[PDB]
Amino acid sequence: QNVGTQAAEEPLNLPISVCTAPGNCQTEADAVVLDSNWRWAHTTTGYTNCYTGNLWDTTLCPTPETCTTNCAIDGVPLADWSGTYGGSVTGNKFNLKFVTVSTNIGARTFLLDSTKTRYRMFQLLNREFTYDVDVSSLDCGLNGALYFVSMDADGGAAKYPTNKGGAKYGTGYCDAQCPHDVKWINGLANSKDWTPIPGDANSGKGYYGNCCAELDIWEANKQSQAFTTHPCTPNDQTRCEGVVCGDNDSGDRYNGMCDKDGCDFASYRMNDHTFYGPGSTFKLDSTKPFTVVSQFITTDGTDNGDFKEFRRFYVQNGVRIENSKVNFPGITAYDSITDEMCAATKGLFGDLDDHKNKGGMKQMGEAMRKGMALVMSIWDDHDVNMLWLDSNYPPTGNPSTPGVARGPCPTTSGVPSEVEVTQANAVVSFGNIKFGPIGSTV
């Protein structure tokens, strides 16, 4: 995309901590940038929309190349962050409102480095990543997500010279779902064969998808939470078409370059329904804030080893809370993501181990070694109504069959039109982000 001249781009300042030992950290003066999908797209030498509602203008965008020549994405000024997009920062806390009323629904954002010209790339192997979260106002159907993806640090600017904005304009998004709803891919409008998504007034799908590796630290609302590894072959940003995208709609979910299911550790799905929930007698009380700690263990305990284990623990009101465990007869009580856990649990659930097909923890680790961009988002799910996270999936499945039940939400929950009314004022908060060696962040 070209860059427009109507509004300066002003990312929100967000300090994080880089740590060397427990309680010995230094501030890193980073910032938050809005994903290019949420930006106004208009004519390069005017005010005329190139995209309105869920459609590209066919006169301006008869082809992707012409669209890209004629159109530009514009900046987010400071005033518009809260007023238009529902984003705000107080000290080291970042807040994202779900619906902001001209009416904005959801948000996806990235962490910029201290220069505000590149994404802050995290080399996560043999490191610990930690943050405080509040998901108390997110119920069934919503997801306040924090995760990493194998985006380029410059959003693709060096690879795709028609991308003028780079990381500064939140470009280059890709993930392990190979999404077609990304409006700008490889420096070009994804306007070919663009199709609105029914019941989604703001979104559509273009000819291409954009694939890359994804490490989900946090997919969650107050009812259920998960962390998940998604390797791809290769891991780096890859525009896809046809079978390579692994499109759900053509029966290709397991035929593409990315592991779409991922290998998940989701406490409720692993059959501990009392670990996490909205109340003081759950082990971890989702009505109150808490700290989420993630440790990425290698084979030799060094930065050069292969990724072998994703460990997790929590801190809430000064109380250390170890992760829940897998709880099925004849299955080891795993409390972390490893290749063995993935094989054993997917075996039990009858899920295809595409994680293993894509190179497993080792391949996931190669993405983490090269460095990944931090994503913070809030969203509802127009495909599957978040049932995969917090309900029975498939909805018609027996909840006593291992793998089906992922949370207590009813199978009628999560319809975007309903959650966008009922949960309009939901806000996820991510704060006090800390990064360092294992054992350094609490």
- Catalytic status, residue 219: yes
CB atoms within 10 A of CB 381: 17
CB-CB neighbours of 120 under 10 Å? 22
Residues 18-48 as b or e (16 or more Cβ within 10 Å = b): ebeeeeebeebebbbbbbbbbbbbbbeeeee
Cα distances from 193 to residues 1, 162, 182, 296, in angstroms, run 18, 20, 13, 41
Q: How far is CA 18 from CA 24, 127, 129, 369, in A?
A: 9, 11, 10, 18
SS3 per residue for 278-331: CCCCCCEECCCCEEEEEEEEECCCCCCCCEEEEEEEEEECCEEEECCCCCCCCC
Domain boundaries, the chain: 2-442
Query: Is 241 a known active-site residue?
Result: no
CB 77 within 8 A of CB 11: no
CATH number corresponding to 2-442 = 2.70.100.10
Beta strands in 35-123 (DSSP E): 41-43, 51-52, 55-56, 71-73, 87-90, 93-97, 99-100, 104-105, 107-112, 121-122
Chain breaks in the chain (C to N over 2.5 A) after: 101
Find the catalytic residue in 9, 128, 219, 420.
219
Cα atoms in the 13 Å half-sphere on the side-chain side of 119: 31
CA distance 312 to 199: 37
Cis peptide before 234 (omega within 30 of 0): yes
Resolution, given in Å to one decimal, reads 2.0
Query: Among candidates 375, 292, 371, 295, which has minimal Cα distance to 94?
Result: 375
- Residues β-bridged to residue 72: 2, 42
Six-digit token string for 388: 């995969």
Experimental method: X-ray
Query: Could you tell me the two tokens for 19?
Result: 């740590």
**Torsion sign across C-alpha atoms 399, 222, 182, 310:** negative
Pair 54, 203: CB distance under 8 Å: yes
- Give me the catalytic one of 9, 214, 309, 366: 214
